[PDB]
Amino acid sequence: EELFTGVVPILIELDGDVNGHKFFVRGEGEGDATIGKLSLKFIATTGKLPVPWPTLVTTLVQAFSDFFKSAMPEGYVQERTIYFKDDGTYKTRAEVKFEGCTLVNRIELKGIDFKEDGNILGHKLEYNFNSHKVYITADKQNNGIKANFTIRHNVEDGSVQLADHYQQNTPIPDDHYLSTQTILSKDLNEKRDHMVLLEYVTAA
Amino acid sequence: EELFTGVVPILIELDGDVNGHKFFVRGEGEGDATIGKLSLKFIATTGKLPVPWPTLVTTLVQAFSDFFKSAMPEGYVQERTIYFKDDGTYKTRAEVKFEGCTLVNRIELKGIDFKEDGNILGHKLEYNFNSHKVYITADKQNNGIKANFTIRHNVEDGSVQLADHYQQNTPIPDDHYLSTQTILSKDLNEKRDHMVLLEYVTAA
């Protein structure tokens, strides 16, 4: 927790493969646990993203709110299976840890079997992200924590795309809620496909 | 230099003794070497300061501009003798180094023999600070660097108070200039005696 008594630089790196569409996203910014504030800018370095930006926000640092903080500097592994309803599945594996002074989130993401001309691959989701409390329980078989939550993404037409997340975390914890509010925006001077992201994370 | 590729929190601690008037100043803020920006707030924790705030600015992180950067994380010792003309002398010894992620500047300062009802002890200096280039040479007898510079503080009446600094730095470097521009201000909501300080440091 010593490390989170102020502003911390963040580097995020996502190597992704969705139906054979590979891409690399680099995120940069800072987090401040004293106020729970995350400010990040992400760049789809490899051209247009084959999936909607909102579908990657949960994959792209719960430390900035404590099992997450006390795992540092060594860090924690975050594994996750994200089922999109009537559609394919992300599988993700990430290490969150300190390198130098810069909390790094390094992620591998594999997306398998989703409809072309569907909400994800057809880019039919609105550029926003809505917040519900997440239940973080002890997972004492793996000496860590687990959580299960669904996420509602709004669709262009008016429908909703559900995305059921299952996640585990282990190092390299009494039950509690974690709430995350998220604004997504664009830099006006940025030519590249990108996402500006602002998050506030608190714990009940 | 790895450590200075972004924002870094700064804790400064000055234990001072001037003509037997003891005091402790705590500084907090951040530095960014990529742009050379220093933003600090200092609190005279022990009541009214027996000396003018501008006389302590040089004592209260040349790292944020490289001998200073490459000495990290271990850090460097900064020793200095500040002769005020027709008046007393500060003697200072400080360690600059990383503790956790927070570059710390810990200083001891002893001020000896100055007139009461003089510019320093009588508080006759204007609340500002003026910048001239500082010559940083190699000091190969002590395996470090040295510098000699005077500073002009403006006096209430219109006169000037010269303050001749002699300094040495060694760890725990081709010759070059270092320029530092400084604004001093007050927080409007701060009841305690304090100094807000904003500095830009560059190297020619």
DSSP B90-148: EEEEEEEEEETTEEEEEEEEEEES--TTSTTTTT-B-S------EEEEEETTTTEEEEE
Task: Find residue A84's DSSP bridge partners.
Answer: A163
Resolution of the structure, angstroms: 2.5
Residues of B in contact with A102 (CB under 8 A): 5-6
Quick check: A30 contacting B, CB < 8 Å? yes
Quick check: B34 contacting A, CB < 8 Å? no
CA–CA separation, B125 and A19 (whole Å): 70
Q: What's the gap in Å between the CA of B181 and the closest CA on chain A? A: 25
- CB neighbour class for A16 (10 Å; exposed up to 12, middle 13-18, buried from 19): buried
Q: How far is CA B128 from the centre of its chain?
A: 14
Q: Do A3 and B30 touch (CB under 8 A)?
A: no
Method: X-ray
CA–CA separation, B17 and B110 (whole Å): 5
CA dihedral B109, A5, B35, A187 (to 10 degrees): -160
Mention every residue, 6+ apart, whose C-beta is less than 8 A from residue A76: A67, A68, A95, A96, A97, A144, A169, A170, A171, A172
CA–CA separation, B111 and B153 (whole Å): 17
Which tokens go with A65? 């709110």
- Asked if the peptide bond before residue A73 counts as cis, ω within 30 degrees of 0, the response is yes
Q: Do A7 and B7 touch (CB under 8 A)?
A: yes
Side chain identity at residue B96, one-letter code: V
Q: Do B7 and A3 touch (CB under 8 A)?
A: no
Query: For residue A101, what is the nearest residue in chain B, using CA coordinates?
Result: B101
Quick check: A181 contacting B, CB < 8 Å? no
Q: Do B6 and A9 touch (CB under 8 A)?
A: yes
Side chain identity at residue A173, one-letter code: P
Q: Do A9 and B7 touch (CB under 8 A)?
A: yes
Query: For residue B73, what is the nearest residue in chain A, using CA coordinates?
Result: A100
CA–CA separation, B99 and A81 (whole Å): 39
End-to-end, the C-alpha distance of chain A in Å comes to 18
Mention every residue, 6+ apart, whose C-beta is less than 8 A from residue B157: B124
Report DSSP state, residue B58: T
Mention every residue, 6+ apart, whose C-beta is less than 8 A from residue A192: A43, A44, A45
Collect contacts of A86-93 with beta carbons under 8 A, ≥24 apart.
A87/A114, A87/A115, A87/A118, A87/A119, A87/A120, A87/A161, A88/A18, A88/A19, A88/A112, A88/A113, A88/A114, A88/A115, A88/A120, A89/A113, A90/A18, A90/A55, A90/A59, A92/A59
- CB neighbour class for A7 (10 Å; exposed up to 12, middle 13-18, buried from 19): buried
Residues of A in contact with B102 (CB under 8 A): 5-6
Q: Do B9 and A9 touch (CB under 8 A)?
A: no
A38, A61 contact by CB (below 8 A): yes
**Scanning the structure block, which residue is given the tokens 């646990």?**
A33
Q: Report the residue numbers after which chain B has a gap, meaning the C atom sits over 2.5 angstroms from the next written residue's N, or none.
A: 60, 65, 172
**HSE on the CB side for A95, CA within 13 Å?**
7
Query: Which residue, A51, A35, A45, A104, is CA-closest to A76?
Result: A104
Quick check: A102 contacting B, CB < 8 Å? yes
**E strands of chain A, at which residues?**
7-18, 21-32, 37-44, 76-84, 89-99, 102-112, 134-139, 144-154, 160-171, 176-185, 194-203
Query: For residue A30, what is the nearest residue in chain B, using CA coordinates?
Result: B7
B76, B94 contact by CB (below 8 A): no
- Hey, what domains does chain A have and what are their CATH numbers? 1-204 (2.40.155.10)
Count of C-beta atoms within a 10 Å radius of residue A17: 15
In three-state secondary structure terms, A145 is strand
Nearest Cβ partner for B3 among A2, A7, A101? A101
Residues of B in contact with A6 (CB under 8 A): 9, 30, 101-102
Could you tell me the sign of the dihedral formed by the alpha carbons of A184, A185, A187, A192, in that order?
Answer: positive
B146, B170 contact by CB (below 8 A): no
* Helix (H) / strand (E) containing B22: strand B21-32
Q: How many residues does chain B have?
A: 204
Nearest Cβ partner for A7 among B5, B30, B100? B30
* Cα angle, residue A190 at apex, residues A22 and A184 outer, rounded to 5°: 75
CA–CA separation, A56 and A25 (whole Å): 10
Count of C-beta atoms within a 10 Å radius of residue A36: 17
Residues of B in contact with A34 (CB under 8 A): none
B154, B196 contact by CB (below 8 A): no
* Cα angle, residue B177 at apex, residues B68 and B72 outer, rounded to 5°: 5
Mutate to test the interface with A, among B2, B28, B99, B101 (most CBs of A within 10 A): B101
Quick check: B28 contacting A, CB < 8 Å? no
